[PDB]
Design a protein around this ligand. Structure first.
Ligand SMILES: Nc1nc2c(ncn2[C@@H]2O[C@H](COP(=O)(O)OP(=O)(O)O)[C@@H](O)[C@H]2O)c(=O)[nH]1
Length: 305
């Protein structure tokens, strides 16, 4: 039984972790790291960690990656203790800010030296947030990639092509929350709550260790030929580029109720096998989830380029 910790660092990461908690992501410990005491108050994470300066006083708002990086190393001993003896560590953040952008590569480096399989799950900022954030996020991703075994990057721009035409500025970030959850849960659920086609940690570790940069796709469908449709949506998801075939490795999960048909599972499995490069390592499994009813959702992670 695996020890999996999910770290949400910076404002966005903490909000993402709250969505995960709110949605009932199980079998994982949630850690919230921030510089701001006030924002940490609204967090529902098991473990919270205030860092850097007091938010109750001076400059909480400034978004400097250098500030966030320094704050992290001033807490390296405390962080290491929170990640003590974990088998897997997820580092979720919204790239572009200060706390997340600079702090994340530190948290990951620590988790990796502890010997844990280190998976970063971050978002690229929306273009409407300006080039300054686009720039910072770009360096923050370069850095975090060095510290992770695998780094899944979700381009926020593509979420707007999926969400409704008339969405608020707040609905936009709720989608960002939801997709970060999708990334994490799509992987952890394979381990914590497997179905008929059982995948164990060793399989996942094999496909994700030193994988480098990675991308994800999600899909879901109902009733009539659902599993195939869901799988098809996932492999064609805009979040995943055309570069599904360019992947060295593919991790795939299909979640559904206890009554998830073997035939269904097989059709999804076959589709991904055909869609991926002939030489790619493909590991795939099923997840039991009664909260889905008669809907099934497929997650595809494509790694190694
Ligand atoms: N998932 C998610 N992402 C967010 C949210 N708010 C902002 N972001 C993204 O995260 C980036 C950094 O913001 P934030 O994490 O709040 O600043 P930081 O704490 O200094 O890292 C922004 O440029 C946004 O693209 C949110 O509520 N949820």
């Amino acid at each position: 039984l695996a020890v999996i910790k999910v770290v949400g660092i910076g404002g966005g990461g903490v909000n993402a972790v709250n969505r995960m908690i709110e949605q009932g992501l199980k079998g994982v410990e949630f850690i919230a790291i921030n510089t701001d005491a006030q924002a940490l108050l609204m967090s529902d994470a098991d473990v919270k960690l205030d860092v850097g300066r007091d938010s109750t006083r001076g400059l909480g708002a400034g978004a400097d990656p250098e500030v966030g990086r320094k704050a992290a190393e001033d807490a390296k001993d405390e962080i290491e203790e929170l990640l003590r003896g974990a088998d897997m560590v997820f580092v979720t953040a919204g790239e572009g800010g200060g706390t997340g952008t600079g702090g994340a590569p530190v948290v990951a480096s620590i988790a990796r030296k502890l010997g844990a399989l280190t998976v970063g799950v971050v978002t690229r900022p929306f273009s409407f947030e300006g080039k300054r954030r686009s720039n910072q996020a770009e360096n923050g991703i370069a850095a975090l990639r060095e510290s992770c075994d695998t780094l899944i990057v979700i381009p926020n721009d593509r979420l707007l092509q999926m969400g409704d035409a008339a969405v608020s500025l707040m609905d936009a970030f709720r989608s960002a929350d939801e997709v970060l959850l999708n990334g994490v849960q799509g992987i952890t659920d394979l381990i914590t709550t497997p179905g008929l086609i059982n995948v164990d940690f060793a399989d996942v570790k094999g496909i994700m260790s030193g994988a480098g940069t990675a991308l994800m796709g999600i899909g879901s469908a109902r009733g009539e030929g659902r599993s195939l449709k869901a799988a098809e949506i996932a492999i064609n998801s805009p979040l995943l580029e055309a570069s599904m075939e360019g992947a060295q490795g593919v991790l795939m999960s299909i979640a559904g109720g206890s009554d998830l048909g073997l035939f269904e599972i097989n059709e999804a499995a076959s589709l991904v096998q055909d869609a991926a490069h002939p030489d790619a390592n493909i590991i795939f499994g099923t997840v039991i989830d009664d909260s889905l009813g008669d809907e099934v959702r497929v997650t595809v992670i494509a790694a190694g380029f």
